[PDB]
Ligand binder design. Structure first.
Ligand SMILES: NS(=O)(=O)c1cc2c(cc1Cl)N[C@H]([C@H]1C[C@H]3C=C[C@@H]1C3)NS2(=O)=O
Ligand SMILES: NS(=O)(=O)c1cc2c(cc1Cl)N[C@H]([C@H]1C[C@H]3C=C[C@@H]1C3)NS2(=O)=O
Ligand SMILES: NS(=O)(=O)c1cc2c(cc1Cl)N[C@H]([C@H]1C[C@H]3C=C[C@@H]1C3)NS2(=O)=O
Ligand SMILES: NS(=O)(=O)c1cc2c(cc1Cl)N[C@H]([C@H]1C[C@H]3C=C[C@@H]1C3)NS2(=O)=O
Ligand SMILES: NCc1cc2[nH]c(=O)c(=O)[nH]c2cc1[N+](=O)[O-]
Ligand SMILES: NCc1cc2[nH]c(=O)c(=O)[nH]c2cc1[N+](=O)[O-]
Ligand SMILES: NCc1cc2[nH]c(=O)c(=O)[nH]c2cc1[N+](=O)[O-]
Ligand SMILES: NCc1cc2[nH]c(=O)c(=O)[nH]c2cc1[N+](=O)[O-]
Lengths: 256, 256, 256, 256
C-alpha cells in the first residue's frame, strides 16, 4: 500500500521544477519538504506518492459546519496518510490529529528595508509604521497579548490611520519595499529569512523572535505511522540532517 | 490519587525557598518548573507532590547494565508519574518515555566576558579561545557534525594546549570571568541568558543558537496523563503563560 | 624495427612547423613532446616515427561498448608502441596501460584578467564569478571534493545565473578576456602559464594549484619499453633536461 | 603471513605517541605515513606490522662495499616487504627497487625569517646570504645546474666567506632564526611548510619550487605488491584522501 503524502505549494518547501512538464511522479516537485519526505520514507522504509492539497489551504474548521478543510481535513477524513509540510502545531489541530516533534522552530519577526533592532524599539518610536495581516495567528497573538510591549504595539496598530494591515504576505513585502524604510512587517521568521535571501535583496530581519512556534509532520489520529515518524524526526534532528536541509534551501540556494 | 512529580534542583527551574526550613510540602520549592507544574495540575485537575530526584541526574542509560538513572529512570521504573523539569527531548529518551510538545526552545550559544557576533567569527580568528563541557550533549554535537565550520571548531578544540574543555559549567563560567575577554564558553542558551542576568553581570550572550533543542514534560509509556499534558502545554503556549513565566524567572527577577 | 609514437596536436607539446608542407617525416613537427621523444629515443637507442592520433582524443572508455578511444585506444589495441603526450596519469588508464614516472607536474589553477591571492579569497567573495569546463577532470574534482572551500565553490557553480560553465577552454579564456576582471577560469596550471605567456598577455595565473596531477609516458601493458622509458624519464629529470625543455617552450619562446 | 612495513622516524610522517610507552603495536606510532599505511592495507586487505629501520637512514649505496643501507637496503635483502615513508624517487633506487607513483610532490624552496620572493631575487642581491646542506641532494643539484640563475647562485655559495653550508636541517633552521633576516635556507618544500607551521612561528616559505621531486612507496624488485600498491596510491590521490591527510598533519595540527 503506497502512502499518500499530502503537501502544499509553498516555497521553499514544495515547488514545481523548471522542467516539471516533462517529468512525472514525485520528480515534478522539489524543496525542503520533498527532501524531508524522502528521508522519512527512507527511515521507515515505505513507498510514498506526493500529492498537493486540492483546497490549497493548511487546515481550519468552519464555524457554522464544523468541517475541517485543507491538509487537516484530508487527514481527518482519511484522504491522506501523512502531511509532510510546514503545518503549525496548534491546539485545535492537536485535538483533531497527531503531530510529531517540530522539525523547524520559528516565530514572529520584524521585516525592514535594508534604526530598529528590537520590538521594544519599534514600540517606543512612531516614525516607522508596522502592521500584520488583517487576520491570522500573528494578529491574534497581538490582539490577545498581555505583555505591556505587545499590548501597546496592538493598541497603536488598532488605532493607526491609515490602516497598517495587509491582505497577503506578498502585499506586506511590497509595502515594505515601496515604503523606503517607513514601514515594518511582522511575519514568520522562516518566511522572513527566505525573502531576505531573494532578489532584489533589499529587506532584512532585525531582532529576535516575538514568540515560539513549530512545524510538525501530521498523521491521522490513531494511525500507525505516528511513533516511527516521530522517532525519524528526532533522529534527523540529532544527526543534523534538518540543519543541512535548512541551510541548503535557504542559504545555499539563496540569490543574495 | 496524588500524582508524584519528579524534578531536579536547577536554577531557575526549581530552587529551594529561603525560609524552607519552616516550610513543608510543595511550599518548600519555587521556580519556573514549580509554576509550570501548578499550571498543568490546574489544567488537568489533580493533586501533586513535588519530589526531587535522589541521584540528581537528568537520566541516561549505562552501557554496562542497560539501566536508566535520574528522572528517566524514575519514570520507566514506576517511581514517578510525571517529570516536569528541563529535560531535553532526545531519541534515546523518547524510545522509553513519552515526551510532550517542547515548552522551551534552546540551543548552543556563545558566552564571552562583556567584535564577534557569530560562530564563524570565532572560527575565523584564533586569538580568543573557546571551549566546551568535558563530556556532554554539546561536545557530542561538536564531535559528530557534518558542517565543516563546526568540524573546524571541534578540531581546534581537541588539538589545543592547554585544553579548552572544562569539568563543569560553573568552572567554564569562572574561566570566562577570569579570562578578561580571552576565553569563550559554549553552553545551552537558557543557562547563558540566566547567567547573563546574574551578578556581577560580567558575561554576555552573543550571536544565535548553533543548534535547536527543546525541554519537554515526560510521562511513562502508555500513561493516561500523556494526552492531557500535551494539550495543556499547547494551551499555555498560545495564551502566553509560558512566555510570562520565562520573563518572570529570567528578567523580572534578574540582578542586572 | 621502427617504433610508432602516437601524439596529439596541442601547443606547446606538439605543434606543426611553419613550412611543414615542404617537410616530411618527423621534421614536420616541433614542440616539448617532440624534444622529449628525441631524448627518449636517443637514450633507448631506437628509431621512431611520430604519428598524430586520428580522432584527436586523449583517451577514455566508452560507457556502452567498453572501447578505448584516443591514444589509450591506440596503445591498447596494438596500433602504437608508445605515447609521448600530455597524458594525465589516472587510475582508469593505469589498469589498461603502463605509465612511467611523471615528467610534468600540474594542477588546477585560477586564471584572471590582468586582491585575490588564493582559492579561499575566490570562495569568500561573490563579486568575481568563476567556473570550470562543462566536463572533464576539474568538474569531477570539484564534485567529489569534501573540503569546505571546494564544496562551496561547487555550490556556487551549480547554482549560478548566468551559467559559469564553459563549453571549451578557448571560450573560457575568451570569456576571461572579455569579462574585464569580473570572471575567473579554472583550468590546468600548465595551460594557464602557456596562455599567460602568449599575446595579448592580458591574463595571469594567480594563487597556487588546487590538486596535484602529472603527465606520463604511456606504454602498452607488458612491454619491453616500460622500464627503460621510466629510467630515461628519471635520468632526464635528475639532469635538468626536463626543466630546460619546460623553460624553452614556455618562457624562452613566450610573447610577453 | 604479515607484511613488514619498514619506515623512518621523521615528522610529521612517523613519530612516537605521547603515551607510546603504555601502548604497543601499531598504535605506538602516529603520523601521515601511519595513516597512509593504514589506507594501503585497507585497499589491499592485508595485515601489516610497522617497523622502524635500525640504521635510521633512507637508503644509499656505499662507494667501496657497494652495499645498500637503510630502508632500501632492508627492501633489497628481503628484510621488509614495503617501505611506506618519504622516500625520494631517484634513478639508482628505481634501478635497484620498485617505486609507485608519487603520493606527494615536493621541491627545493627558500626559507626566510618572517625582500625576497623568488630565487632570481636572491641571486641578484648580496645582502642576504643563502646556503644548503654541506652534503646532500640540494647541494648536488646546485653544483651541476646548467641554468644561468642557479649557476650564479652556486658560484656565490661556493666562493662565500664565511661558508653558508650547514651540517643538518635543524642547524639551517636555527641559523635562519638567529641571523635576523640576513640568511636564507634552501631545503625541501614539505619540511619548509612543516617548520613554518611550528612554534615559535618565525619562518615562512617564499617563492615557488626550484625543482620537482616526489615521495614514492617502495616495493622490492619483483614483488607482487607493486601493482596493487600503485593502484591504491592512484585511487587515494583521485578521491582526495592524500590531500586530506596532508592538510591534517601539516595545517590542522599546526601551532601557528
Ligand atoms: N530548522 S532548524 O535547524 O531551526 C531545527 C529546529 C528544531 C529541531 C531541529 C532543527 Cl535542525 N528539533 C527540535 C525537536 C527536538 C527535540 C526538542 C524539540 C523538538 C524535539 N524541534 S525544533 O526546535 O523546531
Ligand atoms: N520563549 S520559550 O523558549 O519559553 C518557548 C518555546 C517553545 C514554546 C513556547 C515557549 Cl514560551 N512552544 C513550542 C510548541 C508549541 C507548538 C509548536 C512547537 C511546540 C508545539 N515549542 S518551543 O518552540 O520549544
Ligand atoms: N618542472 S616540471 O613541471 O617540468 C617537472 C615535473 C616533474 C618532474 C620533473 C620536472 Cl622538470 N619529475 C618527477 C618524477 C621524478 C621523480 C620524483 C617524482 C617523479 C619520479 N615528477 S614531476 O614532479 O611531475
Ligand atoms: N598535494 S600533495 O603534495 O599531498 C599530492 C601530490 C601528488 C599527488 C597527490 C597529492 Cl594529494 N598525485 C600524483 C600522482 C597522480 C598521478 C599523476 C602523478 C602521480 C600519478 N603525484 S603527486 O603530484 O606527487
Ligand atoms: N510556510 C509559511 C506559512 C505556514 C503556515 N502554516 C500553517 O499551519 C498555517 O495555518 N498558515 C501558514 C501560513 C504561512 N505563510 O503563507 O506565511
Ligand atoms: N540548563 C539546565 C540543564 C538541563 C539538562 N537537561 C538534560 O536532559 C541534560 O542531559 N543536561 C542538562 C544540562 C543542563 N545545564 O546544567 O545547562
Ligand atoms: N595538454 C593539456 C591537457 C591534457 C589532457 N590530458 C588528458 O589525458 C585529458 O583527458 N585531458 C587533457 C586536457 C588538457 N587541456 O587542454 O587542458
Ligand atoms: N624531509 C624528509 C626527508 C626525506 C628524505 N628522503 C630521502 O630519500 C633522502 O635521501 N633524504 C631525505 C631527507 C629528508 N629530510 O630530513 O628533510
Amino acid at each position: 500500500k503506497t502512502v499518500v503524502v499530502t503537501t502544499i505549494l509553498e516555497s521553499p518547501y514544495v515547488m514545481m521544477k523548471k522542467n516539471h512538464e516533462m517529468l512525472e511522479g514525485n520528480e515534478r516537485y522539489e524543496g525542503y519538504c520533498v527532501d524531508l519526505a524522502a528521508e522519512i520514507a527512507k527511515h521507515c522504509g515505505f513507498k510514498y506518492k506526493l500529492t498537493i492539497v486540492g483546497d490549497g489551504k493548511y487546515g481550519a474548521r468552519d464555524a457554522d459546519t464544523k468541517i475541517w478543510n485543507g491538509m487537516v481535513g484530508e487527514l481527518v477524513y482519511g484522504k491522506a496518510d501523512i502531511a509532510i509540510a510546514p503545518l503549525t502545531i496548534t491546539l485545535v489541530r492537536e485535538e483533531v490529529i497527531d503531530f510529531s516533534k517540530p522539525f523547524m522552530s520559528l516565530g514572529i519577526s520584524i521585516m525592514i528595508k535594508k534604526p530598529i533592532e528590537s520590538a521594544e524599539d519599534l514600540s517606543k518610536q512612531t516614525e516607522i509604521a508596522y502592521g500584520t495581516l488583517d487576520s491570522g495567528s500573528t494578529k491574534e497573538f497581538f490582539r490577545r497579548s498581555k505583555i505591556a510591549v505587545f499590548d501597546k504595539m496592538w493598541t497603536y496598530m488598532r488605532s493607526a490611520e491609515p490602516s497598517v494591515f495587509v491582505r497577503t504576505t506578498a502585499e506586506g513585502v511590497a509595502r515594505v519595499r515601496k515604503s523606503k524604510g517607513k514601514y515594518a512587517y511582522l511575519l514568520e521568521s522562516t518566511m522572513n529569512e527566505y525573502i531576505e535571501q531573494r532578489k532584489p535583496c533589499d529587506t532584512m530581519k532585525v531582532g529576535g523572535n516575538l514568540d515560539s512556534k513549530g512545524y510538525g509532520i501530521a498523521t491521522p489520529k490513531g494511525s500507525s505511522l505516528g511513533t516511527p515518524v516521530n522517532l525519524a524526526v528526532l533522529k534527523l534532528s540529532e544527526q543534523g540532517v534538518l540543519d543541512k536541509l535548512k541551510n541548503k534551501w535557504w542559504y545555499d540556494k539563496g540569490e543574495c
